[PDB]
Amino acid sequence: KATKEMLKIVEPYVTYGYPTLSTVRKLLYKRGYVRVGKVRRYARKKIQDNADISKHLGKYNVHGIEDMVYQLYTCGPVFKKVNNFLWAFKLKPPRKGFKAKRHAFNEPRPGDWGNREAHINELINRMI
Amino acid sequence: IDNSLNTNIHQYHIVGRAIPTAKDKNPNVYRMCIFAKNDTNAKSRFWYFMKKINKLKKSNGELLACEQIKERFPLRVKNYGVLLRYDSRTGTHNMYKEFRDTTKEGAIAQLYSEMAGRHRARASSINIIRISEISSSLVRRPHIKQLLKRRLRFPALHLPTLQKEYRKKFASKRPSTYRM
Amino acid sequence: AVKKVGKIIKKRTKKFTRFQSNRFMRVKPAWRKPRGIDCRVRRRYKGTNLMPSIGYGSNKKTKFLLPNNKYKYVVKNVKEMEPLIMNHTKYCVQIAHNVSSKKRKQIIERAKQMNVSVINAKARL
Amino acid sequence: KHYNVKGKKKVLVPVNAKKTINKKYFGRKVASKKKYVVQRKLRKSIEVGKVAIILTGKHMGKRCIITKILNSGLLAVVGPYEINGVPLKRVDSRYLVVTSTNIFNFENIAKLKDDFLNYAQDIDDDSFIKTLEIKKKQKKLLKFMNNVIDKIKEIRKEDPKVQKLEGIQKDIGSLLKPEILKNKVFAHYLKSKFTLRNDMVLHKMKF
Amino acid sequence: KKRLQNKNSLTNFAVRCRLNPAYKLLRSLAVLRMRKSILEKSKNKKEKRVQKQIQKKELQKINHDYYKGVAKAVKKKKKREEKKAK
Amino acid sequence: MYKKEYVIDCKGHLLGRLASLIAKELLNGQRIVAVRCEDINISGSLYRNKLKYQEFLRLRTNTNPKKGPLHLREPSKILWRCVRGMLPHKTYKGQLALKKLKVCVGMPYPYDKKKKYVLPSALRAFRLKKHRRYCRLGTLSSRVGWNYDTLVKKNEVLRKQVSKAYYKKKVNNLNEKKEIKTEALNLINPEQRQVLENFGY
Amino acid sequence: LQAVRLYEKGVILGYKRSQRNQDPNFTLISIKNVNTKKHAQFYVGKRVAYVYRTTKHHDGVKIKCIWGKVCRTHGNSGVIRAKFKTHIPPKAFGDRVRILMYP
RNA sequence: UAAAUAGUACCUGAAAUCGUUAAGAUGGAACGGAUUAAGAGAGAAAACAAGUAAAGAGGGGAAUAUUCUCUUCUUUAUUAAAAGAAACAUCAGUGAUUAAUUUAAUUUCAAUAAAGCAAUCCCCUGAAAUUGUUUUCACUUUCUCCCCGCACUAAUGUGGGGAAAACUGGCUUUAUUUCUUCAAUUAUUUUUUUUGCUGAGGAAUUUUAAAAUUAUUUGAAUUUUUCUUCUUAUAAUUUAAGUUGUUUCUAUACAGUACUUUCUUAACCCACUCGUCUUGAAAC
RNA sequence: UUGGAUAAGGUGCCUAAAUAUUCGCUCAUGAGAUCCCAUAAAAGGUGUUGGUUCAUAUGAACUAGCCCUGAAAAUGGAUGGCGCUAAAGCGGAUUACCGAUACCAAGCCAUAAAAAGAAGAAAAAAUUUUUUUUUAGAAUCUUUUUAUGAGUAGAAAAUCGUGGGGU
RNA sequence: UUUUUGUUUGCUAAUGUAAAAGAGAAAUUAUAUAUGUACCGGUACAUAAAUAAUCCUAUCAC
Ligand SMILES: [Mg+2]
Ligand SMILES: [Mg+2]
Ligand SMILES: [Mg+2]
Ligand SMILES: [Mg+2]
Ligand SMILES: [Mg+2]
Ligand SMILES: [Mg+2]
Ligand SMILES: [Mg+2]
Ligand SMILES: [Mg+2]
Ligand SMILES: [Mg+2]
Ligand SMILES: [Mg+2]
Ligand SMILES: [Mg+2]
Ligand SMILES: [Mg+2]
Ligand SMILES: [Mg+2]
Ligand SMILES: [Mg+2]
Ligand SMILES: [Mg+2]
Ligand SMILES: [Mg+2]
Ligand SMILES: [Mg+2]
Ligand SMILES: [Mg+2]
User: Fold this and answer.
1) Torsion over CA: A24, A28, A31, A35 (sign)
2) C-alpha–C-alpha distance, residues D79 and A29, integer Å
3) What residue intervals traverse the membrane (chain G) (predicted)?
4) Four-point Cα dihedral G78, G84, G87, G89, nearest 10
5) What is residue B67's three-state secondary structure?
6) F163 touches strand J (CB under 7 A)
7) Cα of A15 to ligand 15 centre, how many Å?
C-alpha cells in the first residue's frame, strides 16, 4: 500500500509494470550487479559466480542467481533482502526509443510515464 | 504482414466491480467494450468511465476480466455507424458518423483521424458511445451510400507511390500521371 | 587527439595555451587558469580553449616514460651514473646542459660501458 | 580435436605461443596460455572446383578456379596458367568472390575430378611461404633497373619449392586445359577479367 | 581479485552453467523438444481440433452473449433518446 | 549525382522543390545545368506570385541601393537565387556549390545536344492537384520587367524544328539497327541465340 | 578496357553530424545505386579507400590512400557511415571514394 | 684585440616597434578551439639486426714483465630475433543487422473433393416483439431470365419493376494439409545470416577451485535421446581463467619524399572584448 | 577517450534524419507553420468541411473546424532563410530514422572509500651450456576493487617557481 | 602540330587539380493523355504508358 502511494507520488517521473519471469531472468543475467562489502561500503560487482551471493544470502537459504530470480518473480519470504543486495539496474536507453517521456502511457496520445502493467516487459527487452 | 499500414487500436471487453464491503457484500459488476491502443490503456479508459458514471474508482474496485475482441470476419466490408461525444474549444457535442470498414477497430482508427482532421478534436476529448454495423437500408450518410452502389467501378486517379529503390531523383523521361 | 605509439597512450598532444595568449603579447602562453566572471573559458563554452584537468593524466604505469619506454634521469657527473648500472633498461641518461665537452665525452663513454642509453649524445659533437 | 558447446562443434587446431610478455613483479612469461585455436571454418559456398574472382592482387579481376582448401585456412587457386595467366596462387577466402559456377558440374570436365583432387592434395601450405635465405638473396641485389628485376626473377625461379609448385601447376594445366578449351564460351569466361559496370549494382547481384 | 571482462552469462555457456547448475538439463530438454519432426505435430493438430469443439462453442456463447448485451444497451439508449425527444 | 554534369530540363517543374533538389546535389558535388528556366512553374496564382515578387522588389537598402537585395528578374537568375537561398553560400564549400550551378534560358550551345534529365519529385503534374492555380515563371518575370520572353519563345520554336529533324534521323537509325539485329540473330550460333532470347535481347 | 573497376563508386559527404556539431570520427558515404537501408546493409563490412593525389611525391608516388571499414548504415536513404584509420579531411567532402568488394 | 655585431651612445642586449629576404594567405576584420590534410622545417634516444667471424685503432682489469680475459670505436660479411603497423583468422566483451524456432495461450484461418442443408436464405448482421429464449422479415450472388425505358448507361451495358438458381457465399458433414493454409499477439524457448567497435591485465598458488568440452570408466533416471541428464574415477583441453596466432610491410634502413614531431597554411563545424561592479555585460 | 543506444527536438534544402507511409481539413488580391515567444478581439461570411435540431430533397434554424473580413506606422524584411499548396500548412495515426558533455559497455586520470600487504625463478633465444631482459615489498608506500567527478564567493590539501640562509 | 625526357644572388629546369576509372545516353509534349505516320487545327491508322526497373558500350592480348 505504502509502496503504491510512493509510486503515485513519483508517477510522472517513472514507468513501471509487472516484469514477467523471462524478463526478470534476463535482467539478472545481463544486467545484474550486486553489492559486495561490509555494510555501507559496497562495490558494485557483477554476479557470474554464486559464491558472491551465497555469502551474504546464505543465512536466508538463497544460494545462486536462480533462487534470487525466483524470489524476485514471486515476492518470497526473502525478497526484500535480495532486492537490497541487487545494485539498482543501470539500463541502456531503449533501442527503438520512447514515445514521449512528457506524457503518460494511458494518455490517448503517445507517452510513457504510467503503469504500463504488462508492456513494461517489452520496454525492458528493448533497453536491456 | 504489413506494419506500415496498421493502426493498433483494438477492442477490449473489460469487466470490473467495486471491492465488496461488509455493508454491500454483493456489488454490481459493470462491463464495456472499449477501443484502446493496448490492454492497459483499455483498463484505464474503463476506470475513467466507471468514475464518470458510477461512484467507482480504481482503488476501490477490481478488474474481473479484460478479454480483447478480435473481429470475426476481418476481411468482410461492413458499414459501421458510430456515436461520439466530443469537446471543442468552445463546448461539448454529440455526433453520429459512419465509416465503411473491415472491422470495428479499423472504423475507430478512421474516426479518430477524421475527428482530428475535420474538427481538430484530439483523442483525449472524444468518447465513443457505441459502434454498430448498419445494414445498408438504414445508411444515412451519402459518402457511404455511394459505396453501397450495385456494380461499383472507378478509375485509379491516385499517383504512383513507387518504392524508395525505384524513386530516383533524376529521370530520363518525364513520367506520366495518366497511366491508362 | 589521442596519440598511441605502443602501450604509451597520450590523451592530449596539444599544449594548453593561456586564454587570449594569441591576442596580446603581454599574455604568455603558459597556462594560467582564468578566474574572473564572464570568462567563457572558465565557463567552458564550445569553441574556446580547453582547461587542463586531471582527466587528461597519463596512466600511472607509463607516466613519465618517454617514447623510449625509459624514465629520463639527468646526470651531471660520473658518480651519478652509478645508480643506473642496475637499471640500464628502465632509465636513460640525459647529460646536464652545463656539463663541459670533455666531461660530456667521459660520461658518454661510461654510458656505453653500462649499456645505458643517452638521449643527448651529440651535444657539442 | 574439437569442442561441441551449444551445438556448434568448433574444431581445434594446435597453435604455438610466440609472444613473451613481461610478468608482474619477476620475469617474463609467454602470453598465450591457450594451446588450441578454433579453426577458420570457410563459408558454405567455397567448394573444391568453383570459379572465383581474385579481387585484390596483381591478378586483379582474373577469374580463376579454386584448387585446395589449405588447412591453414586460406586456399589455393589456379587460372590453369596456360589458359588464364593466373599461376598456382594462394589466396584468402575474403579476397575471393566465389561464383555459383563449378568446373566439375560440366558434363565433359566432371570426369577428371579424382586426378585434380590428387594433384591438390600433393600441394602443401609450406610450399608457398618463401624461405629467409631466398629473401636475403633478393634483397642483396639493391646494393641498374631492369637488370635487377631480371635477377630477382631468376632467384625466384631457382627456389626448389617454387620449382615444385610450377611443376604442379603445369601438371594441372595438362590435366585440365584441353577440355576447357573445347568448351569455348567457358574458356573465354575463364580468360576474361570480371568488371563492375553501370547497371551492375552489386548489392542485387547474386553471383 | 583483479576484475576481468565480466562474462555474458546468457550466452557464454560455461558461465551460464556455473551460475545456474540446472540450466544444462533444461537446455537439453529444450533441444530434445526442438528435435521432434513435423508429422507428429500435424497429427496432434487433429487431436487438438477434436478436443477444442466444446471450448470453441463456449467461447462463441460468451462472445455472442457480450454482443447481445451491447445490442440491448444500444436499444435502451435509443429508447431513452426517443423519450427525451417526445 | 555520380555523373559529370546533369542537365536538368526545368520545364514543368515546381520552382522551390526543383531548387531544393538541385541544392542538395550541388552540395554533394555535382555540376548541374538547369536549362529552359523560362518554363519553371510556381504553385501560387500568377497574380499572387507577382505580388510576392513586387514585395521582394520593394525591399531594397534604404541608404544606398547599389548594394542590398539585387532583384535579378531573368527566370534563370530567379532560379539561381532560389538555389542560393538553400545553400550555405557564405562559406567556401557553399560558394563552390553555387558556382557549380549553371542556369540558362531556353537551351544553347552544348545543352541542346546533352541529354536532359527531369526531377519527378518536383514536377508540377505530380505535385499540384489540377484544380489549383499555378503560374509559368517566364510570364511572371515578363510581368516584372524581363522583356526577352517572346524572343526566347521564338528561339525555342526554332530549336524544336531542328530537334524534330534530328529525331527523325535517330528513329530511322534505330529502325535500321533493329532490322540488322533481326537479320543477324539468324547468323550467330543456336545456343548463344537462345541464351540471348532468354535474357531479353 | 585498360584497368578494371572492382569497387562501387562513392561520394564522401560530411562527417556524422548534429545540426552544428561535427563528430569527425565518422564520415558519411553515398554509394552509387544504393537507395535504402537494406541495400546499404549489404556493404556494411566492406573496406573503403579514399585515394587522393598530391603535388609532392611520397613513397615515390603522387597518390596516397586512407582506408576505412564502412561501419553501419545511416538512416533510411542508403547512406553509410564509414570509419577511417585516420580521419578524412573536409577538403574531401565532395570527393570520390572507392568501396571495395573485399571481404 | 682572444673577441670590435667589445669602437668609447662601448658588458649581456629581452619586448613593444621597424627593416631585409623567403614562404604562405588575401570577396566588408583578424586571431582562436576541435579535427584532419597539405606544405615547409627539424629529428633516430622505441621507431630493426643482438652476437659470431676476419684485423685495424684504442683503453682497462686480473693471474704469476706477460700470459689470460673484458670491453669502446672503425671496418669488410654474417646470421639473428624483437618492435610497431597493416591484413586476415580465433576467442571474449559490447552492439547493429535478417532470417527464423519450440511448447502453450488467446471465439483465428485457409484450401482440398466427395456428400448434403436453407433461399432475402444462411456464418453473421440489422429493424421490430434484467438476462437467457421463442417467433417476425430484413439482409447474398450473377457473365442467369422476363417486362417497361427501347441503347435510355460512367461501364464491353444501363434506370426502374419483377423472377430464376445456388455456379457465388454461408452452414452441416466425412476424411485430407507440401494443391494451398497453419495468422497475429502474448507467454515460454532455441538458434542463425552478415557484421561494427574494444583487447584493460599479465595472477611466487583464488589464471586455483569448480563450470564447460573431449576421449575413456562405475551406477541410476524418464525428457529413449550421435549436445539425454546427473555421478564413480582418469587424463587432457577452452566455451573457464579480459587476444591470441599466421603472413606480409616498415626493412636487410641510419634518414629519403617513408616514419615521429614542430610550425605554416587551407577546409568542415564551432568560437562575441578581456578585466570589472551587477539579478543580468558581447554590450550603446 | 572509443563504441553503442536514446532524450528534448526534429527528418524539402540551408541541417544530421522522411520530398516516408496513412487519413482528413485548408487556397488566402498581404495563407499558415510548433511551450515560454515575441500579439490579435468583439462582430460578421449563400467560402468550404463536418455535424445537431427541425419541418415539408428542398427549406429553415443553429453548431464548430479550417479559411476570409474585421487587420492601419513610420530604414527594407523576415514561419530563422529559401521556399512550400497530391505541403515542406493545420489535426491525427503509423513506422523508420537523425540527434547531447544525459544513458549504456570498455579503457585511462584523479578523489573517496574498500579489500590486503613488513621472499620466490619465469620465459625466450642461441648451441647440455651460454646470452637476453626482469628476479618487486619506498606504509602519506605497493597491489587490487568499487563508486564518483559541474561550480562564482569562499574553504582546504598537494604540488610549481623566484631572492637569500644552514646542510 | 608531333616526338622524347621530365616537374622525385631570391630564383634562373619545371606541378597543379572541390574531384576519371564506361563520370556512356540530344525528340518533343500532355499530365482527365501524348507522340509519330498518311491525308484535309480536323480525320484514320499505328506507337509509349514501373518511360535509365531501359538501351548503348567493354574482356575476343600480341
Ligand atoms: Mg520521439
Ligand atoms: Mg516539465
Ligand atoms: Mg555572471
Ligand atoms: Mg677563449
Ligand atoms: Mg654579440
Ligand atoms: Mg664582463
Ligand atoms: Mg652592447
Ligand atoms: Mg573594398
Ligand atoms: Mg453451394
Ligand atoms: Mg594486453
Ligand atoms: Mg558561429
Ligand atoms: Mg543595475
Ligand atoms: Mg564582461
Ligand atoms: Mg559517444
Ligand atoms: Mg539512432
Ligand atoms: Mg540531409
Ligand atoms: Mg522543415
Ligand atoms: Mg570540481
Assistant:
1) positive
2) 53
3) none
4) -60
5) coil
6) yes
7) 22
Query: Would you say how long chain A is, in residues?
Result: 128
* Ligand 2 centroid – CA B47 distance (Å): 26
Residue G14: phi, psi to the nearest 5? Answer: -65, -170
The separation, in Å, between residue C29 CA and nucleotide I153 C1' comes to: 28
Cβ E13–D7 below 8 Å, yes or no? no
Instruction: Report yes or no: D140 and D133 within 8 Å, Cβ to Cβ.
Output: no
Q: Specify whether the backbone of C55 is left (phi greater than 0), alpha (psi in -120 to 50) or beta.
A: alpha
A124: three-class secondary structure by DSSP? helix
List the chains bordering chain E where 3 or more Cβ pairs fall under 8 Å. Answer: A, B, D
CA distance B80 to B102: 9
A82 sits in which H/E element: helix A80-85
- Asked whether A18 and A10 are in contact (CB, 8 A), the reply is no
Please tell me the distance between residue A61's alpha carbon and the centre of ligand 14 in angstroms. Answer: 43
Nucleotide nearest to F117 (CA to C1'): J52
For strands A44-46 and B10-18, give the pairing.
Answer: unpaired
**What does the angle CA C28 – CA C32 – CA C35 come to, to the nearest 5 degrees?**
125
Looking up cell 465503411 gives: B100
Q: Give the residue carrying C-alpha cell 483523442.
A: B123
CA-closest candidate to residue D203, choices G73, B144, B122: G73
Long-range interactions of G85-90: CB distance < 8 A, separation 24+: G87/G24, G87/G25, G87/G27, G88/G12, G88/G27, G88/G50, G90/G14, G90/G15
D-chain CB neighbours of E27 within 8 Å are: 6
Experimental method, per PDB record: cryo-EM
Q: Do G101 and D55 touch (CB under 8 A)?
A: yes
DSSP string, F72-132: --SHHHHHHHHHHHTS-TTSSHHHHHHHHEEE-SS--TTTTTS--BB-GGGBHHHHS-TTS
Tell me the structure's resolution in angstroms, rounded to a single decimal: 3.2
CB contact under 8 A, B174 and F118: yes
From the centroid of its chain, how far is CA D73? 9
State how far the Cα of B17 lies from the Cα of B46, in Å rounded to an integer.
11
CA distance D146 to chain E (A): 56
Which residues, other chains included, contact G10 with Cβ-Cβ below 8 Å and sequence gap of 6+?
Answer: G29, G30, G31, G32, G48, G96, G97, G98, G99
Judging by DSSP bridges, how do beta strands D96-102 and D50-54 pair with one another? antiparallel
Within 13 Å, how many C-alpha atoms sit on residue A101's CB side?
6
Quote the cell numbers at residue C101: 665537452
3-state secondary structure chain D: CCCCCCCCCCCEEECCCCCEECCCCCCCEECCCCCEEECCCCCCCCCCCEEEEECCCCCCCEEEEEEEECCCCCEEEEEECCCCCEEEEEECCCCEEEEEEEHHHCCCHHHHHHHHHHHHHHCCCCCCCCCHHHHHHHHHCCCCCHHHHHHHHHHHHHCHHHHHHHHHHHHHHHHHHHHHHHCHHHHHHHHCECCCCCCCCCCCCCC
The whole-angstrom separation of Cα D62 and Cα D192 is 6
Would strands C3-4 and B10-18 be described as parallel, antiparallel, or unpaired? Answer: unpaired
How are strands ordered across the β-sheet holding F101-103? F5-9, F31-35, F101-103
Choose the closest CB to E74 out of B31, B69, B130.
Answer: B130
Query: Is residue E49 classed as helix, strand or coil in its secondary structure?
Result: helix
Those residues with Cβ within 8 angstroms of residue B65's Cβ, 6 or more apart along the chain or in another chain: B13, B14, B15
Residue with nearest Cα to nucleotide H78 C1': D136
Closest by Cα among E16, E43, E46 to E30: E16
Which nucleotides of chain J does any protein CB come within 7 A of?
8, 15-33, 36-37, 49-60
* Contact list, D202 vs chain G (CB under 8 Å): 8, 33, 42, 101
Triad E47, E52, E56: Cα angle to 5° = 155
CB contact under 8 A, B130 and E77: yes
Radius of gyration of chain D (CA): 21
SS3 A77: coil
